[PDB]
Design a protein around this ligand. Sequence first.
Ligand SMILES: *[C@@H]1O[C@H](CO)[C@@H](O)[C@H](O)[C@H]1NC(C)=O
Ligand SMILES: *[C@@H]1O[C@H](CO)[C@@H](O)[C@H](O)[C@H]1NC(C)=O
Ligand SMILES: *[C@@H]1O[C@H](CO)[C@@H](O)[C@H](O)[C@H]1NC(C)=O
Ligand SMILES: *[C@@H]1O[C@H](CO)[C@@H](O)[C@H](O)[C@H]1NC(C)=O
Lengths: 110, 110, 196, 196
Amino acid sequence: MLKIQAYFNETADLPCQFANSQNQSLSELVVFWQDQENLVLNEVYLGKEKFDSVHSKYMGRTSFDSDSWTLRLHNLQIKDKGLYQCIIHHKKPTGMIRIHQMNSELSVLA
Amino acid sequence: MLKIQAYFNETADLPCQFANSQNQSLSELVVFWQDQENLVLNEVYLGKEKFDSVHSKYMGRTSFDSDSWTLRLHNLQIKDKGLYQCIIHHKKPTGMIRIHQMNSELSVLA
Amino acid sequence: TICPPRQDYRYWYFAAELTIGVNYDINSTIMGECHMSESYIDRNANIVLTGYGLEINMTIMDTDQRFVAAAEGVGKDNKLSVLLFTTQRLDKVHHNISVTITCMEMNCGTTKYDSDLPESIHHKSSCDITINGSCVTCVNLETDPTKINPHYLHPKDKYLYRNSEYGMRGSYGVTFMDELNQCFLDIKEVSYDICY
Amino acid sequence: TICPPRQDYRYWYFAAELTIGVNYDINSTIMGECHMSESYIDRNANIVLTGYGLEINMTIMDTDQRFVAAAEGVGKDNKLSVLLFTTQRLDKVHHNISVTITCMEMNCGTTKYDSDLPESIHHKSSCDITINGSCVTCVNLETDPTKINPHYLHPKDKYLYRNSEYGMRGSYGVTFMDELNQCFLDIKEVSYDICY
Ligand SMILES: *[C@@H]1O[C@H](CO)[C@@H](O)[C@H](O)[C@H]1NC(C)=O
Ligand SMILES: *[C@@H]1O[C@H](CO)[C@@H](O)[C@H](O)[C@H]1NC(C)=O
Ligand SMILES: *[C@@H]1O[C@H](CO)[C@@H](O)[C@H](O)[C@H]1NC(C)=O
Ligand SMILES: *[C@@H]1O[C@H](CO)[C@@H](O)[C@H](O)[C@H]1NC(C)=O
């Protein structure tokens, strides 16, 4: 329900609008942003960024913001149009339960 | 039961003799006149003439009269001989019920 | 003239037709879908035939006729045409009719229509229609038809008759969508498998 | 709209899917392994289907739907995908769901998980998951899917519908291993033999 359009080779922002009804902290939650091929983009494991699986193409090009919960991606391409997802997990002692998911779509001038 | 004969390329009149036992108004009733191929000729939706489906050949050629409930058709042709029907519908909130139908036939000199 | 025979199976047929326009999806005839039950015992003719997704329950009051057989087919744009073959006509009195269409698949529900159709084509007979469900967009009933009722004129042994006097045909109709008059035409890919 | 028909076998289908990621070994579909039992009597829909090594017991509260059928297949990396076909949708209310996965071969045990999944994708419905045993590594449940649910679109006679409104889909998930999101993808060597 959130479509983003960007001018040619412009910068892109992917938010996923977590309500946070319980007022939890980033240290008890993990966040994944993934593309339509399921390859990961970025990860905040217990609050510290991890880059153990980001594909080289996405390495470094992405940045995170704490208060805004938004992923800032640079260097757009015509072939980078597609869908992206913000899968949020709550890391309880027993397991991880998915407590948020928000689909977004981005396209480029052609 | 009503056959109409007209001289070569003469004008034609199609009535359908609605008894109107309940003494209703044209605003609560709709009327269609159709040919033997099921293509519509004219339509009085809630009393206002509508021309959203009349085939171009019949556009403008037909005229309506209120008191007489008769359709006046101009520009007869040898190939326009056939059957015609006067379907009257009563547009209640629930739906439309057909409360009159009259078949007529017209032929031209040959 | 007074009596009908009350036989097992009739070699002599007649006609009366109707068509139901439903919104859920029907592709083609299934060759064995229909199943009908007929009765006359009460002095009133009756036939309940269950088919593609709805059961049609038709009854004629003061009839002197009994439904010999029926046929059912599906055409274009989700229409369902049922022909009904009655024994033989002894008199011209323009009977009343009662038809209930109950949706048994994909739109079940309680009653949504309980009015009567005036039929002022001659203004002598009235039909009462009751629809259970929401699987109806058009209903047309032609009594004493003059069209070519016979499907594959004619079955191997039976003989079939059809009215040819305009003064006896009647048309009852009710539509909920917009201007669907002449809800369907007979001679098409209609297969018309016998209703049993 | 009020009622469902309560028929024998349904020509009209729908969809809702889920996938269980188990650690013991499964190679390929066996063509006749699954066996399912359905019920509606209590006002709540229910389906218990026993398959490759676990029985899945799913229940929908205040449903107006009944599970017509199901299908089950096995993919790559020991995943088990079960599609569930329900009759038809009468309303949009976002029912709750209760699913219990009981391991019946190679890792039996007593209860190891009894929490509830919030599903804040819209944050209207909650699913309660109970797992007996240790033969689970991922659980995903997609309600009102928009993907291509139909396996071999479509079985010989049945008709199948699938939701196309994003506002109604829901996703419930729980994982014990590390970052197994999107636990499996549909169109693969998945055979999808009918579940009966
Ligand atoms: C058919 O309708 C009549 C009245 O219209 C009713 O008495 C009868 O029970 C109906 N038949 C069935 C099988 O429901
Ligand atoms: C009987 O003859 C009539 C006309 O010759 C024909 O319409 C009908 O099909 C025949 N029936 C049989 C059983 O031969
Ligand atoms: C399925 O689960 C329900 C409650 O979740 C339970 O009452 C029922 O007995 C279970 N069915 C079986 C076959 O165990
Ligand atoms: C019915 O037709 C639809 C579309 O034409 C098709 O998707 C479906 O498979 C058909 N079903 C049968 C039994 O022919």
